[PDB]
């Protein structure tokens, strides 16, 4: 459950991320596949090589989904209903993997935002990602 | 932990540039801010009421130096993390009863701090090697629970 | 995130507890204290002996908060804000302990309401308890 | 796992009443229903589309008997769980890569099934004894990760 301060931090931080969202999503995915190889079994038909166009394209989709969540932070279940169906009902992703991707996104943000990844921002973004993870791993239709 | 010759090389090189006086306190400080229930184990440390109080807390900084010193110990004994952390495992498990997931959290917060400090230098390959190290450390600290 | 079916299952099962509120809440706490001794650190001044009058009175409050949570299932953050202040801001309970008490509540329900504790209901109750747990461990005020 | 003589006797007595052809399947089926993501590991079992389909799935019941059996072997070797489960640990960790949290979930589901079957007979003290057993089992299964 995000407080008003968390929401403000998430909207400001993601706003800072800005046009680099797609790139960060792709880097987060790459860090995940390398750091936690078991996650790769979820992407059997993907070219997961460093810099693959497929991962960059997918990173963009992930980013845009997060941007959408940020813009509907007070009503994420509704805004992410289709993604929840995909991850929770169809793919049945173990929730542990969401902790891994979230951690890799935080590591990516930290690596790219030396001037803005403050402890409060880090804390609000962690809660935001945990909230998104809960929605995507829940079957609520 | 595993760690290939090259990974060990990468890990060692990056650690040589880590501030022994600050990074530990930053990792412990961020753990206290991001996962607030962990403050329950540090009441004697003083004011932890705001991110600023936590990050500037003198006790958090000093204590963090010891925490960092323990990671340095592990890095110098990658082939025997369990033995190296034996004393700390009995402390965290038998005396303090810290839930092991928290060991995992602090390790990931440390990774975030290393990423914060090194920027682009904290490449995916370098992170992957460090993930093996923090996982080894968390497992070693939780040993008394196994 | 609870589905409509989850809410229907939870209200149908929990509603059968009724006046057993204190007894069952008290039993869940006792199971937790005996099964996971570390949880006792949260109740230093409490008499945790078997038929403790203190445990019984407290168990009744726990069970009634759950009944309340069930009624405001779609508005838990607001309904349980005071409990959040208590567990997250004041007590700083480690989230792991909520999984422990939730499991002990499920055991208690399974031991007393066998006809009601079907696999579907068990699944809905776990999600409901997990949701209550998130609210109580989050600082959103 | 350390069970006092009294706990060991209570655990043994109860287990002797367990239906060896049903309880395993009930525990495994509830694991797949309560924690749906675990189904990803058992898609070869066929239809697992709904709670009733899972619980009535013949392969879930059959595999369930094996799981119950491993638990039985565990109860017969509380002194040496690591060794008893060494092979299963390689299978579940090195091959299937099952996150260890799931081992804990299955143990707790089994506990819910025992409670479901024995009702008031599954007293708080008996549960405490069984929690030591299932935590030891999960621990031994995750041994290859330690
Ligand atoms: C922050 C959490 C995540 C977000 C917001 C997210 C978002 C998305 C989006 C937007 C898509 C593309 C959907 C489309 O094509 O319309 C997708 C697909 C997918 N996601 Fe995620 N996802 C997340 C975490 C995960 C995790 C942890 C895994 C597994 C390790 C995962 C596995 C997949 C897979 C396998 C696909 C399908 C790819 C394909 O076959 O085309 N996702 N995700
Ligand atoms: C995972 C890495 C961790 C390492 C390497 C580590 C390291 C240390 C070390 C070196 C000490 C001091 C030992 C001494 O010289 O006396 C210590 C004490 C302690 N640690 Fe940790 N620790 C870790 C995680 C944790 C976590 C996750 C918690 C709690 C959420 C925690 C809470 C404590 C407490 C309560 C004490 C200090 C007691 C006091 O002075 O009041 N530790 N730790
Ligand atoms: C299902 C989740 C839980 C619910 C619904 C719940 C509910 C409550 C309620 C209603 C109160 C009593 C307020 C009053 O006196 O009116 C309370 C107090 C308390 N709870 Fe919880 N609680 C939950 C989980 C936990 C957990 C997991 C722990 C720790 C193991 C915990 C520790 C405490 C403590 C220490 C108190 C204060 C007792 C005292 O000193 O008076 N609670 N809780
Ligand atoms: C208490 C923990 C568990 C025990 C005692 C246990 C026991 C077993 C046993 C006895 C086998 C078959 C061994 C053989 O004869 O080859 C097995 C297989 C397997 N287990 Fe587990 N298991 C446990 C938890 C889990 C969990 C939590 C998952 C996954 C979420 C899992 C996934 C599997 C799979 C995929 C197989 C192979 C089944 C097949 O396709 O035939 N197990 N387990």
Swiss-Prot record, chains A, C:
Effect recorded for residue 6 to Y: In Woodville; O(2) affinity up
Modified residues (N6-acetyllysine): 16
Residues given in the record as O2 binding sites: 58
Reported impact of residue 80 to R: In Ann Arbor; unstable
Annotated consequence of substituting residue 19 to E: In J-Tashikuergan
Alphabetized PROSITE patterns for the sequence: GLOBIN
Note: Gives blood its red color.
Protein name per Swiss-Prot or TrEMBL: Hemoglobin subunit alpha
Protein's organism: Homo sapiens
Gene: HBA1
Curated annotation (Swiss-Prot), chains B, D:
Effect of residue 70 to D: In Seattle; O(2) affinity down; unstable
Phenotypic consequence of residue 75 to P: In Atlanta; unstable
Consequence of changing residue 22 to K: In E-Saskatoon
Effect of residue 141 to R: In Olmsted; unstable
Residues the record marks as carrying a glycan: 1, 8, 17, 66, 120, 144
Record-annotated site: Not glycated: 59, 82, 95
Effect of residue 55 to K: In Matera; unstable
Modified residues (S-nitrosocysteine): 93
Effect of residue 7 to G: In G-San Jose; mildly unstable
Organism per entry: Homo sapiens
Protein name as catalogued: Hemoglobin subunit beta
Impact noted for substituting residue 139 to D: In Geelong; unstable
Effect of residue 101 to K: In British Columbia; O(2) affinity up
Effect of residue 126 to G: In B-THAL; Dhonburi/Neapolis; unstable
Effect ascribed to mutating residue 123 to I: In Villejuif; asymptomatic variant
Outcome after substituting residue 146 to Q: In Kodaira; O(2) affinity up
Effect the entry attributes to changing residue 127 to E: In Complutense
Effect of residue 44 to C: In Mississippi
Organism domain of life: Eukaryota
Consequence of changing residue 23 to G: In Miyashiro; O(2) affinity up; unstable
Consequence the record notes for mutating residue 111 to A: In Stanmore; O(2) affinity down; unstable
